[PDB]
Amino acid sequence: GRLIYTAGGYFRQSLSYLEAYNPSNGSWLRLADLQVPRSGLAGCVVGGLLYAVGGRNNSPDGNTDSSALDCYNPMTNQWSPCASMSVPRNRIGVGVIDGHIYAVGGSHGCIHHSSVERYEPERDEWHLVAPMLTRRIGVGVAVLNRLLYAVGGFDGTNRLNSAECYYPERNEWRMITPMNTIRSGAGVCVLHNCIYAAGGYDGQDQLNSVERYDVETETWTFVAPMRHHRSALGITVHQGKIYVLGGYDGHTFLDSVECYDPDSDTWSEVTRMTSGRSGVGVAVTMEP
Numbered sequence: 001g002r003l004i005y006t007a008g009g010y011f012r013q014s015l016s017y018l019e020a021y022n023p024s025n026g027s028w029l030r031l032a033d034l035q036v037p038r039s040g041l042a043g044c045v046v047g048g049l050l051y052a053v054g055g056r057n058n059s060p061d062g063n064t065d066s067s068a069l070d071c072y073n074p075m076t077n078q079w080s081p082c083a084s085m086s087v088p089r090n091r092i093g094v095g096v097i098d099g100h101i102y103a104v105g106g107s108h109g110c111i112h113h114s115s116v117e118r119y120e121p122e123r124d125e126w127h128l129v130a131p132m133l134t135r136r137i138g139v140g141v142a143v144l145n146r147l148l149y150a151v152g153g154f155d156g157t158n159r160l161n162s163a164e165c166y167y168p169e170r171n172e173w174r175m176i177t178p179m180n181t182i183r184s185g186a187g188v189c190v191l192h193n194c195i196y197a198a199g200g201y202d203g204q205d206q207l208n209s210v211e212r213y214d215v216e217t218e219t220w221t222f223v224a225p226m227r228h229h230r231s232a233l234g235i236t237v238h239q240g241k242i243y244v245l246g247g248y249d250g251h252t253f254l255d256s257v258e259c260y261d262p263d264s265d266t267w268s269e270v271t272r273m274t275s276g277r278s279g280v281g282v283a284v285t286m287e288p
């Protein structure tokens with residue numbers, strides 16, 4: 001059985017929680033806290049290990065952007081530090097290709113990064129790769145057919161509908177078709193042949209809309225909207241369904257977890273997180 005792991009997040013201050021949800025029975029398990037509270041991070045998995053990447057510790061005693069990479073082993077219930085990134089990256093996006101972690105964009109104070117770097121677990125080393133064509137924080141990242149996509153975000157001045165693709169063997173970014181909606185702090189994932197962008201902030205409102213990019217047609221199509229408007233949501237895929245976790249709706253730090261069934265084009269409520277929060281990192285791996 002595989003669990004949906006939610007790491008960190010924000011309610012009043014940045015959080016250290018690691019909790020795991022089991023779709024097979026509705027249960028939540030609280031696991032070992034992150035060593036350092038963080039929101040605006042990303043989660044990913046490589047080799048059955050959960051990684052927490054970037055973020056920011058928003059705390060009453062100071063706000064510190066994170067260049068940290070930390071590894072959680074479900075077999076031991078222990079977090080271990082890895083090599084830090086070249087730069088702090090709050091409101092980060094990440095994607096995994098060929099067992100390597102790409103860290104994309106994010107902020108360091110008023111610096112909005114276009115830079116991108118790649119982590120190799122076997123060497124515990126980060127190396128920079130070609131930068132994006134656009135500065136993006138709150139960037140959605142996903143991987144399809146061993147290509148890396150950076151979707152929407154905030155460039156320092158404007159929220160973006162634009163998106164771009166990284167071609168690893170050319171070390172090159174190229175724009176793709178823009179979304180039909182400006183989205184910053186959306187949830188972005190892959191399902192089947194499509195990149196999905198769910199929710200986010202358009203500069204005026206938190207969004208419930210959802211659209212998907214078919215790489216074969218190079219077009220974006222809206223699907224059913226989520227039941228809750230949400231920015232700074234966590235998103236992942238478990239057994240062919242998209243799950244979205246928490247976020248912010250202009251009013252509440254959501255505990256809502258919803259899931260999308262692509263065959264029925266429907267969202268449904270599945271569970272509540274143990275407490276409302278935004279800016280989590282989420283990924284899926286084996287039970288502890």
Ligand SMILES: CCC[C@@H]1CCCCN1C(=O)c1cccc(-c2cccc(-n3ncc(C(=O)O)c3[C@@H]3C[C@H]3c3cn(C)nn3)c2)c1
Pocket residue numbers: 009010039040058091092137138139153154159184185200201206231232247248250278279
């Ligand atoms: C730190 C509290 C303030 C924060 C931002 C305003 C709404 C409340 N709050 C959060 O709950 C929160 C906390 C921690 C992290 C994140 C977090 C995570 C990942 C991406 C982003 N991100 N990257 C770009 C943008 C943007 O503004 O363009 C965003 C903000 C989410 C977008 C938003 C703005 N507003 C009014 N509502 N939503 C933010 C959020």
Ligand SMILES: [Cl-]
Pocket residue numbers: 039040056058090
């Ligand atoms: Cl923040």
